[PDB]
Amino acid sequence: AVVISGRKLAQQIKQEVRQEVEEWVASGNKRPHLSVILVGENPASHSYVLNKTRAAAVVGINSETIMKPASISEEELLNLINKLNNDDNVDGLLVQLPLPEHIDERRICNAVSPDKDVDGFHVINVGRMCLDQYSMLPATPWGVWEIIKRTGIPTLGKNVVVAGRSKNVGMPIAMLLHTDGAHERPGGDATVTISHRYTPKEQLKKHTILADIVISAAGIPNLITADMIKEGAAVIDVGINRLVGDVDFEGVRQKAGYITPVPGGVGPMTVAMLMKNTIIAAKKVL
Amino acid sequence: EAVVISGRKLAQQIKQEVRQEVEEWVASGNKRPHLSVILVGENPASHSYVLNKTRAAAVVGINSETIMKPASISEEELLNLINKLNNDDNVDGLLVQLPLPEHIDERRICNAVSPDKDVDGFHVINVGRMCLDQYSMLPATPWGVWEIIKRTGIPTLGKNVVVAGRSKNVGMPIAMLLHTDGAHERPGGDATVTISHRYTPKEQLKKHTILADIVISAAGIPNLITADMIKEGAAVIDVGINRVKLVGDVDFEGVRQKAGYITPVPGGVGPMTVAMLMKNTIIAAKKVL
Ligand SMILES: NC(=O)c1ccc[n+]([C@@H]2O[C@H](COP(=O)([O-])OP(=O)(O)OC[C@H]3O[C@@H](n4cnc5c(N)ncnc54)[C@H](O)[C@@H]3O)[C@@H](O)[C@H]2O)c1
Ligand SMILES: NC(=O)c1ccc[n+]([C@@H]2O[C@H](COP(=O)([O-])OP(=O)(O)OC[C@H]3O[C@@H](n4cnc5c(N)ncnc54)[C@H](O)[C@@H]3O)[C@@H](O)[C@H]2O)c1
Ligand SMILES: Nc1nc(N)c(NC(=O)Nc2ccc(C(=O)N[C@@H](CCC(=O)O)C(=O)O)cc2)c(=O)[nH]1
Ligand SMILES: Nc1nc(N)c(NC(=O)Nc2ccc(C(=O)N[C@@H](CCC(=O)O)C(=O)O)cc2)c(=O)[nH]1
To answer: Exposed, middle or buried by CB within 10 Å (0-12, 13-18, 19+), for A78?
Structure first.
């Protein structure tokens, strides 16, 4: 059972971006700049944001992390977002989630200018994604897709089970993998089952045993065990649980054809696909 | 034997409800609602459907007009008409009947309808909001599919649903509505939903439908669904309309012997589409969203 290294794949992707950025700068353009807004003291968020600005510097993208206390109000966050939207030096702008409960996450995401929305969370980017149009794709779902494509695991006509339906992770993953290879933004042409918190465990297993690709994005440890997987299927662990994913790694290790580890799997791919999006935003292709 | 769900009967009831809501709106002293339909070319199915929409408008007390244009119209001329209608305060709802000719970009057309008048739910903002489970103008055929299920009392939470078809105006919204959270702004069905399409091998489709409590076929393939694919007691909703006579995607007579529920073609989802459009038009006229 091949253990796919997300670290190695994201290394290639980041090298590609570093090349694309250097060539872009060589032709006289402004160096790309990414602004990350971070709210409060969530230790995972700080770690994740640090991994994003480390990767940016490595690929020639300038960055600033702007840290605010959790006691910030919604109006003050909106003010900051608006100043950044109007700062021509800023090409990409993202607000790290989760935000405190007194702040409306959807209003914040919709406040980032769409051309700077390297998260792909603005409702117009969500809509364009769901219509298979050119869009800024969200980093974690695009990272899952890249994991699958660059490992050469086929999707067209194959059975895919996604565990989870969150709008930032599980749902874009299901959208990418079932949609038409031939559309503006190609999809994976797979047969996709969406399961979630109301799928009975027994019904989950009855679909996973049929799956050539099981993608777990629920945030429950050991949700995916070896009896649910069929021999040779690919299992992609998006979950992050305090650290393990959603898959029983050691057991499923012995039945799957491929598997991603946690850490070092999807995580570093999320950071890598954000670099792609940032150079895309700098070029104003979309 | 399977209960046959009359979509025409359900739709007629829904139109009575819309008629009452429109009369109350007018009696309260608001302008009577007006729906404009733009029809391009001479697709006979399109002319049929638009005639059914304008009839239903008259039944429910909504003023209407179909504006017919030759297929040789240019995209810019269609956008000029759309802009004119966007700016007419007498028009509450505006829709452009699909499909359009090849030289007209359907997405740009749909995005040019002012979102408050977008009774189709095809504007990208309505699509985005729907995919986020936010309040939105829901597209008529998927909403009609949802209402057949809800008004017949067929359960969805925790159940297995297979949708055959992934088109952006029909199959994708049906899949979105049925799998999403019951507790969100726009509630969903909380079902476990398999999305199949033109590259799903016939043997793999069957392997999923046989587990399904609800099978929703919107492919446009006669006899795509047959009795061996359906588990006994399951609900089967036939969105397809295929000229062969008009048939659905379902082997009606065969699946009728195994399903718990089934919708006919014609007289099933079709009239439900027209009824849910009338609902969206009074919604648009009220500026609720
Ligand atoms: N780069 C990465 O590796 C990366 C990036 C982002 C998020 N994640 C992780 O992905 C996971 C989920 O993402 P989120 O934060 O958007 O999740 P969330 O907390 O919003 O919800 C997770 C989803 O799992 C579903 N679910 C719950 N119980 C289930 C069950 N028994 N069977 C099937 N589905 C079930 C829920 O309905 C929900 O849709 C988390 O672990 C999150 O940290 C990983
Ligand atoms: N009110 C109504 O009943 C209503 C309204 C609109 C359209 N329709 C009908 O619904 C059908 C489809 O409409 P559309 O606009 O989505 O059509 P479309 O041609 O845009 O889409 C066809 C869809 O079917 C899928 N498909 C094709 N072969 C398949 C197969 N073997 N298995 C599974 N999926 C397969 C395709 O991949 C695609 O997703 C047609 O019969 C159309 O006339 C009905
Ligand atoms: N706005 C916004 N908010 C968000 N919360 C996200 N998700 C968002 O950052 N996910 C994420 C998860 C893990 C890692 C990561 O670096 N994972 C490493 C190690 C992390 C750790 O040490 O815990 C790994 O899994 O190998 C990076 C990003 C996002 O993409 N955008
Ligand atoms: N803009 C736009 N274009 C579109 N093409 C649609 N779909 C869109 O009109 N579907 C539809 C299908 C069938 C009927 C209908 O009246 N069906 C009847 C009989 C139809 C017939 O005479 O053939 C039935 O199914 O029983 C009405 C609408 C839409 O909703 N919006």
So the answer is: middle
A278 located within any domain: no
Number of domains in chain A: 2
Do A131 and B133 lie within an 8 Å CB cutoff? no
Residues A145 and A105 in one domain: no
CA distance B26 to chain A (A): 34
Q: What is the CA radius of gyration of chain B?
A: 19
Q: What is the CATH number of the domain that holds A84?
A: 3.40.50.10860
Q: Give the number of A-B residue pairs with CB atoms closer than 8 Å.
A: 103
Q: Is A189 a catalytic residue?
A: no
Range of the domain at A96: 29-113
The answer, for A192 touching chain B at a CB cutoff of 8 Å, is yes
- Which residues, in sequence order, are CB contacts of A14 under 8 Å at separation 6+? A55, A58, A59, A272, A275
Looking at the structure, do residues A85 and A162 belong to the same domain, yes or no?
A: no
Cα A206 to Cα B211: distance, rounded to the nearest angstrom: 9
A130 vs B157: CB contact, 8 Å cut-off?
no
Task: Say if CB B220 and CB B169 are below 8 A apart.
Answer: no
> Same domain, yes or no, for B146 and B221?
yes
Which residue out of A108, A135, A165 would a mutagenesis test of the B interface target, given it has the greatest number of B Cβ atoms within 10 Å? Answer: A165
Break-preceding residues in chain B (C–N over 2.5 Å)? 244
Both B159 and B262 in one domain: the answer is yes
Residue B161 pairs with which residues in a beta bridge? B193, B214
Q: For residue A243, with 0-12 CB atoms within 10 Å meaning exposed, 13-18 middle and 19 or more buried, which class applies?
A: exposed
